[PDB]
Design a binder for these strands. Sequence first.
RNA 1: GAUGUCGGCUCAUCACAUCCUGGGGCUGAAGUAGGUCCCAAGGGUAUGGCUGUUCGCCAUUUAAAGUGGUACGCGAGCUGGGUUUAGAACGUCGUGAGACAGUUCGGUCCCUAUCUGCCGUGGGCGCUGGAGAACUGAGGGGGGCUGCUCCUAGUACGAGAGGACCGGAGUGGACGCAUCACUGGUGUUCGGGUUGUCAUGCCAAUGGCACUGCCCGGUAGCUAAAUGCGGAAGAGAUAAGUGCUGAAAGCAUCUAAGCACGAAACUUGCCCCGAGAUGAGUUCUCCCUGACCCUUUAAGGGUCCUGAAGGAACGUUGAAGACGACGACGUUGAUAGGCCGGGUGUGUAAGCGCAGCGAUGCGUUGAGCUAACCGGUACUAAUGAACCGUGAGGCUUAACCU
RNA 2: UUCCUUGUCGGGUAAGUUCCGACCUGCACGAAUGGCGUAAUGAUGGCCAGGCUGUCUCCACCCGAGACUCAGUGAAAUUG
RNA 3: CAGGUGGUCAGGUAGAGAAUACCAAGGCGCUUGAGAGAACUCGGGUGAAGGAACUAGGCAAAAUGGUGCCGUAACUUCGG
RNA 4: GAGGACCGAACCGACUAAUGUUGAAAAAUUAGCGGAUGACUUGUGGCUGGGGGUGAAAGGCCAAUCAAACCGGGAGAUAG
Lengths: 114, 209, 123, 125, 56
Amino acid sequence: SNIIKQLEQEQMKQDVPSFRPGDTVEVKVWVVEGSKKRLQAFEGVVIAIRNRGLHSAFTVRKISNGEGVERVFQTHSPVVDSISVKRRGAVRKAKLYYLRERTGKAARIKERLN
Amino acid sequence: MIGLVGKKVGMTRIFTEDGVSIPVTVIEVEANRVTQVKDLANDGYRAIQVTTGAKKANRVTKPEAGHFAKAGVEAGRGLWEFRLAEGEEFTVGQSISVELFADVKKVDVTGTSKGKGFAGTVKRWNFRTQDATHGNSLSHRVPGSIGQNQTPGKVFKGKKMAGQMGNERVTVQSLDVVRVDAERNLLLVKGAVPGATGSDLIVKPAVKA
Amino acid sequence: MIQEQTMLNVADNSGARRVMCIKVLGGSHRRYAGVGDIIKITIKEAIPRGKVKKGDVLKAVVVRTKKGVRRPDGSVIRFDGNACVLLNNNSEQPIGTRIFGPVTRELRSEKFMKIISLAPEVL
Amino acid sequence: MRHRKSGRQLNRNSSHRQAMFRNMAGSLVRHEIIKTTLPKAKELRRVVEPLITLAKTDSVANRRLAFARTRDNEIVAKLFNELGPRFASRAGGYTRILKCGFRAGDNAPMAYIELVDRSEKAEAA
Amino acid sequence: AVQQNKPTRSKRGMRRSHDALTAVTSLSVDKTSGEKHLRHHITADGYYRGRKVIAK
RNA sequence: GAUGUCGGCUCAUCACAUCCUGGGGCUGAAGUAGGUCCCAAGGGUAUGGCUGUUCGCCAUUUAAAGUGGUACGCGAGCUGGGUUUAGAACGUCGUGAGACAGUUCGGUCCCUAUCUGCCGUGGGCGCUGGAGAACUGAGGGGGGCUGCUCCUAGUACGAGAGGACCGGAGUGGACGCAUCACUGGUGUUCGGGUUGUCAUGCCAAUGGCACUGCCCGGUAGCUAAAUGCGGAAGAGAUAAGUGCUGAAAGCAUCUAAGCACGAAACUUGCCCCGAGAUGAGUUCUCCCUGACCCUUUAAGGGUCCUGAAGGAACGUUGAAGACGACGACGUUGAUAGGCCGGGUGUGUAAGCGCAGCGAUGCGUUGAGCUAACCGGUACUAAUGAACCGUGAGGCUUAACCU
RNA sequence: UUCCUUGUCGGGUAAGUUCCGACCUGCACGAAUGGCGUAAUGAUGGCCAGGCUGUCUCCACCCGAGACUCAGUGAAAUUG
RNA sequence: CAGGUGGUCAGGUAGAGAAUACCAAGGCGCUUGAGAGAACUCGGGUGAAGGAACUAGGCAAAAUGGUGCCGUAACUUCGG
RNA sequence: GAGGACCGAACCGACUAAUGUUGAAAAAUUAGCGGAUGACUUGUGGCUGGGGGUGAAAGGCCAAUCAAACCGGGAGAUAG
């Protein structure tokens, strides 16, 4: 409705960069440990994107210390400080859920090369 | 304190600058117009009757139209009463806005829950499903036993059985008021409130703490 | 989201490789244990010369789950497997001296500061 | 529950419904008026009227796409050569449901559904 | 499960007190042909709201 | 001329001789922790291993893992392991047929609900002219659990070890209600990939069938594992208990007169239903202000005229729904469909061009398509009517006006 | 085949009245109404493990056939 | 009347095949329909995390599944 | 190129589960299951007769019938 979308558009970020599934991004989040607040980076592959305006989200997957980690970010949350695309991947699908079953050389993604 | 009658616009979220997402319910609260004031002398109890919204003149009946004309207000989509606490004074025709909740911290929201129709005992009363295998014969989601043998010889009143579920009056208590937007007739409460999108809601200050 | 009979990997160097949750502690009829919850475990597989052996009954704290944790802004942090850290049965202190793989900040408490300080990466 | 769901099941499986409405849409544009039950007629609107909207833009892509929905070249030809131009200026609502009596065999509520511009000049062809 | 006593003709009539049919309240009259018809239904000769809609 | 018999499952309900939580007295009660008794039934009161098991033992929890009644509650609700038929075998007894609460392997669990009951949901009439609303609340139901940490305070207490009452704050478990913003599930009505085959003349492109052919994603809706909220505080009267004053009985004495405290029980407070509450309540608003005849002359019958408020019906329908019901709307119209725009999902259509011997690749191109979503739009369908409902509403008395 | 009996000890399990190994105290084994072994075989009995899973924790949604409503036809057991 | 009933005939594509899938020749849509899209029952599909905790018992379901090649234990009556 | 050999359709059988249980059916259906060159299966015809037959033995089978078939008769058996 006109009422709710008006409340949502005034909370949305205006500078979120464009990225596709398959690109490796570096997300910087705010980590509060009391009186301090630093930026912790989280670099990995974008395997899913949910476009819902204010409720948009994307999930990044990375292999950290031998353990696979997926993190779903709320792209318009003030916790997410910045988003930067490192390299652009070339995939055919919109959800790269098959990457969960692959590793090493099997989880490689061709560069989009645009 | 008296309450207000609003409409459930929907649900969204409010991001706090410190990185917290608050699920809110948007309640459109237009001006509530007082249509009748009841007192101990004439009615035996103190209360106000309010209306809200608008209504097409071709859909209001003569009995209803004469009631609104008596008060001098435009016909709304319904009438609701609010018991007056000692010290509250209102005059007929007076309009009440959402800024009444400016300093209210918690509210109770009353609405009509969504209707589930005829519901089984599993859905309506959280009964346990019997075995899906191991010989069970046509008795997977049935309620099982409904009483004892001959000694009572009957089913006790209030037994939990299948029947109509939802579509009834439900009150959620002690919801935090996130934001009161007077100029836009909006009231944002934290959490979820009964009813579907577009249903009427009754918002009162929290009777408890 | 760990319950009884759930097999977990071990995220420390105490010697165990596979443990099985036999009880979710901290409440009657308690069903699941998330990241940061204490569970009773039995050791199903250990290395030949570790500090623990197959068959012992200890306590453990869950540090990684496939179900994941939820952050106050609605984010989720999921892992590829369930992992725990073995604790002394009565002192609730970590048995091993090293921690493998990342952990989350749900463990950020004076009770598990030993684990946070040893973790290679805190999420 | 059924909240906000659309589309009638009509006591058929999915593949039968799709085949039936494909045939019924072909019969409607071939005769420009047919007689069917009222529930079938109301659901037919959501099938045939999108085909007429599609037929307003003649192109090999639209023709093939229309052929995929109807599987009849005689039907596709009439859509793009007759019904397209005939409804070029009308913005939706190309059909009209006229309720009639009840079927003698089963007391089913019957209804006529026709194209709106089925006038006295339709007798030319 | 089956009855233990034969229900009476009185009980049978009480159950059928809701089985009565409801006749159609009133028929509409076409403005052109003056025929009677069910409201919102075409007439027996193919008229509806004063228009020959089917030529049969 | 049959009352299905153990245990389990599901679903319970009551008792109190109380397992936990609450209130107390005594203690061989320092504290912590107990012992015992009194009051108290509001709520709560494990998961597994073994066994047909009830039980029990064991493992590990928990504030606690209460004891009983209810046809050893519950097979026209489930199960069929046990017991309890016919087969077979062992040990044993018998010359033998056979037998053994000895053992062993195998071994058909029917019933479409008339009545009572119960859960829901309507129709009728009533409530005294009719109608539309908003209420009052007699009465009924729901709900009532509790851990841990911190502060008070390492204080009181104690040789030390240890370690509080009372009071406050936070955070959990279990349970309940609501909801779909988030995280997810589903999503045979959306998009794509692909195997076999058949067809559309053929190529190309599509469609059918193969569990939706097999799969990968996924909108709305529904939904839990998702996230909001709940249990109270307070008040009244009390239980056990503790008292004040105080005689009978110069004293003493909580009691006899009188007075004060006192618990999750009781009555309220919170939520829901609720005037068929026939004791049928209240408030507001709206509508109807014609004749005439007959007769046994009355709460009488009849004819003509009149038909209101409103209702129902019909239609378009709904996050309402088995059907009724309930809600919205019916051209003075956004009720549904379509249409337009957007969104979302899928992931770069087809055609053409180019490269390649070719499979294929690249460009046009984030293309094409897109359900239930959002915002618009009278294009289609919601019709002029007709129908029901009337015409000032009994008697008595009392206070008021005439 | 053992009543006492869930004998005792060992193995397996966090926990094993079942299972496997042993002991001999064989209530009441025993040598063609055969004794003890035995590869292969078994819709045979018992037990364990991997895999697998809505069997379950704890159910959710969906697709169909009924149930429900309308029209036509039209039973039955039972019954002072 | 979803049962039973001997013999003969044996197309195409894929396939080891008379299996199976889709078709030819040929023959049929099974003698009540129409709506609706509740509980519940039946027959199916999918499922977060867990993975036998279910249960008398892994009952049922899920899973495995083809061809070629490599490789293959105790034990054995020398064949497995 | 042997085999009461192996896998597996027809065919024969009937281990499990669900459904059905006034059934579609007085024993079936659905999904799995066993045998499938043999102690195999099947057609047509024949033979064995009731204290008798036949029985790879269950008191099984002998026309939906079996610890002594069916039909008629003794017969209105007898019934504390």
